[PDB]
A paper describes a structure:
Indeed, both hNLRP12-[name] and [name]-[name], two targets that failed to crystallize using fusion proteins expressed with the V28E vector, crystallized using fusion proteins expressed with these new vectors (V28E1-V28E6). Similar to the hNLRP12-[name], the human MNDA [name] domain was crystallized as [name] fusion proteins using three different protein expression vectors V28E3, V28E4, and V28E6. All of these fusion protein crystals diffract very well which led to their structure determination. Structural analysis shows that the designed “helical” linkers are slightly distorted probably attributed to crystal packing. Nonetheless, the target protein structures from all three different crystals are essentially identical with an rmsd of 0.30–0.40 Å, demonstrating again that the [name] fusion strategy enhances the crystallizability without alteration of the structural features of the target proteins. Structures of the hNLRP12-[name] and [name]-[name] determined with different linker sequences in different crystal lattices show no significant perturbation of the [name] structures.
[name] is one of the most commonly used protein expression tags due to its exceptional performance in enhancing the solubility of the target proteins.
Numbering used by the authors: 2 to 468
The structure:
Amino acid sequence: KIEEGKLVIWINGDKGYNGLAEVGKKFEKDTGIKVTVEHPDKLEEKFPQVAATGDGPDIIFWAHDRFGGYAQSGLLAEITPAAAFQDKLYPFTWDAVRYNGKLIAYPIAVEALSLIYNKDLLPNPPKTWEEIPALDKELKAKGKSALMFNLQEPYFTWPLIAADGGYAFKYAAGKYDIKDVGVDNAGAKAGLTFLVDLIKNKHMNADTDYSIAEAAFNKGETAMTINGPWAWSNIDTSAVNYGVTVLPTFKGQPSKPFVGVLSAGINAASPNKELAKEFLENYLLTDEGLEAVNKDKPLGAVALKSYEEELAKDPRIAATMENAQKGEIMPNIPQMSAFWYAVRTAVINAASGRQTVDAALAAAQTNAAAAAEYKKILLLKGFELMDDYHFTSIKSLLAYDLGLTTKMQEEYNRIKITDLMEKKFQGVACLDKLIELAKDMPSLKNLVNNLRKEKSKVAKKIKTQEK
Ligand SMILES: OC[C@H]1O[C@H](O[C@H]2[C@H](O)[C@@H](O)[C@@H](O)O[C@@H]2CO)[C@H](O)[C@@H](O)[C@@H]1O
């Protein structure tokens, strides 16, 4: 499926993919091996879909938080660099790409969000979130606004949720406790409430996304944005005299961004693993290779010691690391996918008014901790106890809810439907839905009765967890 004798690379559309293609051109000139760089939409979801069957790119780039899930799924080749190469990168960046004792990617660069501000509109940026409402009032009187940033991805709101105490998974005695989630504690609620209050008081708009915020800052319409180093080169080309600085404090506490390590993994199905390693170690992870990417879109604080010694003198990188040091490196555990999905739903629902802050975060807390368990019940006590005839009928009844074509209704197995069903009906909702759909099927009445019992069992187990 994957073509032998060339390299296909996937990297996100906000990174320096034209600079990476230039590294690939040098590789081709030395070796004759052509290197194609692509930036597919929804890359972090598309890779595990195609790689599951042995398709996809030779090399996948993403922040390290997704890579434990990919490795658990067997989608990644183990990385075994010689000690001489391993010593060229900072040890903590190798930690970010180690999963169950195995290196599963090459670390490239350390990313953290900073406060970016327009020095002509705002010579002295605010030290606190709490000052921003008054600043917005003052700027609105000049036809401007104080702050716009992407409110569709929870990555950008996390620094504020985490500031007063919110967390993802508790790190306890050397490992993450996948049952101890910190998204509905008092600190998380306080931060999300402040965000929702900014929207209620017309200092931000719930529909603001990456493109809208970037355009508004780079056109000089808003005084501040929150973004990572990849954003700097577009501001450079704009007319904005900008600075990069520490994020504002909340309730006197630093904002705590999730720190990501841009990482490159090798597809377990690649027939080009030797070439992919040669490209990543000896073409990309060099001063000249990282510079080629960095001049396109800045990487942040790179993992390669020799080149970071040059970048560290840049005040923008100093600000990036100051923010990174106030935050936490993301876990790479497989549960991160469910965490991000739950938190994305909570922030969007709270910002839009669809849910209160308390209700939105309570659901995200339960579902980040318990989605896997509800899915196990749905699969093993629901779908695997019904025959193919009834499974086909249930897929037909779910066709509108899950968007299933006739071919999808034909090809999708019980594991896939379980995944899709819980994405649509999060947590306990997926059990309720199957119970509702199978209430009236005569041959499934026994199956349905036990699902009610299973639903009750986990409800008890969920409470014993919280107290
Ligand atoms: O919003 C949740 C999202 O956050 C992170 O994605 C970041 C990425 O790390 C940055 O490099 C940049 O591209 O922005 C993304 C947010 O739009 C996580 O890495 C990702 O897994 C998670 O879904």
